[PDB]
Structures are given as C-alpha cells and as structure tokens.
Amino acid sequence: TSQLNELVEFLHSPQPAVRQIAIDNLVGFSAGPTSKVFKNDSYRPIKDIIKMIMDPEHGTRVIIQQGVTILVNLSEDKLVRNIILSDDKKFLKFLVWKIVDLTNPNADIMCILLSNLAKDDGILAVLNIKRNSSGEEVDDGLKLAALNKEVFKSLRAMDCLMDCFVKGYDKKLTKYASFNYLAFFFADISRFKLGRMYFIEEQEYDGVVPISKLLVFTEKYDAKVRREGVASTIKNSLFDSETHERLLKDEKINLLPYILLPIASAKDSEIDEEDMFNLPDELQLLPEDKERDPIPAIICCHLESILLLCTTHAGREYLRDKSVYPLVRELHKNVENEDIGELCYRIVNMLMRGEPG
C-alpha cells in the first residue's frame, strides 16, 4: 500500500463522514512499519485523531475506540507520547475523566493508553487534575460527565482513578472494564518523586494512605497484570529509606504481610515453631493449598522491596522480628531460580549486619 499520506490528511477534513472513513481505514495501519505515516507533518495525524476523540458531537463509541487503539499502538514512541501529553493539555484531562465515567465502554483501552503515557514525566500533571464539582461540568471546552457520587467522593482525578482500580476489579463497577492496567499506570508514575509521594501520604478525601489500598492485590492470582503493577508500585514507594520506619510501623497500612505472602508457602517451608510465632498474623495458619507467586519477576520485585527495607537498622530490626529471614531462607531452598537466589542472599547479607557506629 503506497499513498497512505493522502489518506491520513482526511483526518482533518471538515466533513465528519470523511473523517469517519479515513480513521476506519487507518487503524489497521497503526501497527507495524506503516505506522510511520502518523508522524507526517510534525505528527499532525495524531493531533487530528486526538481532536476526533474529544469531539463531543462526533466522537462516537467506534471512533473513540479506533482512535484510542491507534494512539495505544503509536504510544510506544517517546516522541508520540510527548505530543499526546503536551501539545494539547486538555486531552489528559479528557482521558482520565472518561476512564472514571462508568458508562464509558472504551475505559479499559484508555487505561492502557494512560499506562503507556505514564512513562513520560509529563504524566505528573494528573496529580493536579481536579474538578470544581461533581455533576456535569464544562472545563476548557471539555464536557465532563457527572461523577457517580456514591463511589467517587473526591474531585481529584488521581483519587478517582484509585477508586476505579480498588473497587472496579472483576467488573464490579462496570460491565465494560476491570481497570487492570491502572496497575501499570500506578507503577510508572510512582517512579517519580511526586508520584511516590501520593502513594505514601494520607489523602484528604478518605483519610487513607493510598499504597495500603493496593496491598490486597498481591495475591490476586487471576490477574497477573494487577500483581505485577502493584508489586512495582510498592517497590517504588519505598525508594526513600527515611520513610521506612513510619510505613512499617503504621498498623493502618500493615505493609509487610502483603509483601511476604507471595513468597510464603504451606507445602515446601520448614520453619521452627518459635520462628512461626513471630510471623505476622496474616502469615500464620495458612491454608493447605497456599503457594508462592509462580512468576519469578514478581517475586524478585517483592524481594527488591524487602531488600530496600533492609537499608536502615530500624528496618532490619523490624524485619528480623517478623521472621523475614526464615521466610527468605525457605524461598531460597525451594525455588531454584538464580535471580531469586541471588536476591535471597543479598537480603541475608543485610539482615546479618548489626547496628552502625
């Protein structure tokens, strides 16, 4: 196929029917070598597609679906992501409020787009996106749908996205979405200092430290995406060792048990009675079928978190008192994976150390 260049220009035709036909024929070419065409004329096609998606009148279910599909494919390019975020600031606002709209059938692929955009630090703007009110509202030419007041108590976008992920798993808020890929969004945004601070500080709308609301999903073994993203979010949240003592000893957060459960097993582990007594309550009287997370990369991520918590003496004391060493030892014994093994002994190397001077 030759002259795609002519076809892509019809994306900014004044006639809706033309735009409709153009994007319908272009979505197929957004994957693979032919995707180069969308970067023609300083990424004009991408700007046009964004304009099409946000159109309150002509932005149909299909056009949004096809438009977002294209962007998802093209968002692999750093330069494309830059256009999506900075060229027209309102799109990111449009995107996050559409995800929160529980009547939006394209919510999940929008979560995927959002998670891809989180690779760019421009994503940090999300932390500042807020509404004047719930209920229908106009904002910089955007028609924001009314918030469901029963489930969304905040006017801040980040809080609402958190609500979707925490309460919307297994289609519990919408028949259209489970918001799994918000886990990757959380993972990538928590890499940045300002993103990390959201997750480890108490928020106003519910009076809860956000990272605590994600911990339960470390054991959701029918949602690999959720486990992966949450694991990385926990790890990123522990970047500053000066915050470790507070986070570990906050009983409302109860952080440690949800890092340890994925590496704990009922069948394999040999742990003394005295050591078992010191485990967190959640780790005792495990069910007989309790097994470790089978995916090594997830386990290693949990071990990286434990290793981070070994940075301070107070941290190491806390981990030792909770029988983290026996747990790590048995993991080392029973899971023959060199990456896991290496991390296990790095943790022991730290827990072997006494107090500095």
Q: List residues binding Cl ion (CB under 5 A).
A: 223-225
Residue number of the CB atom closest to Cl ion: 225
Is the distance from CB of 345 to CB of 306 less than 8 angstroms? no
CA 230 – CA 328 distance, rounded (Å) = 20
Closest approach of Cl ion to the CB of residue 302, in Å: 18
Closest approach of Cl ion to the CB of residue 255, in Å: 24
21 vs 225, which CB is nearer to Cl ion?
225
Say how many C-beta atoms besides its own lie within 10 A of residue 130's C-beta.
14
301 vs 308, which CB is nearer to Cl ion?
301
CA 50 – CA 347 distance, rounded (Å) = 48
223 vs 286, which CB is nearer to Cl ion?
223
Q: How far is CA 73 from the centre of its chain?
A: 18
Contacts of 317 (CB under 8 A, 6+ apart): none
125 vs 225, which CB is nearer to Cl ion?
225
CA 226 – CA 183 distance, rounded (Å) = 5
Closest approach of Cl ion to the CB of residue 220, in Å: 9
Closest approach of Cl ion to the CB of residue 173, in Å: 17
Closest approach of Cl ion to the CB of residue 183, in Å: 9
Closest approach of Cl ion to the CB of residue 180, in Å: 6
Residue 93, helix vs strand vs coil: helix
Closest approach of Cl ion to the CB of residue 115, in Å: 13
Is the distance from CB of 29 to CB of 35 less than 8 angstroms? yes
Angle between helices 157-167 and 182-189 (to 10 degrees): 130
Closest approach of Cl ion to the CB of residue 227, in Å: 8
β-bridge partners, 130: 156
26 vs 118, which CB is nearer to Cl ion?
118
293 vs 330, which CB is nearer to Cl ion?
293
CA 258 – CA 247 distance, rounded (Å) = 13
224 vs 290, which CB is nearer to Cl ion?
224
12 vs 220, which CB is nearer to Cl ion?
220
Main-chain dihedrals φ then ψ at residue 55, nearest 5 degrees: -55, 115
Output b/e per residue, 29-64; b: 16+ Cβ within 10 A. bbeeeebebbbeeebbbbbbbbbbbbeeeebeeebb
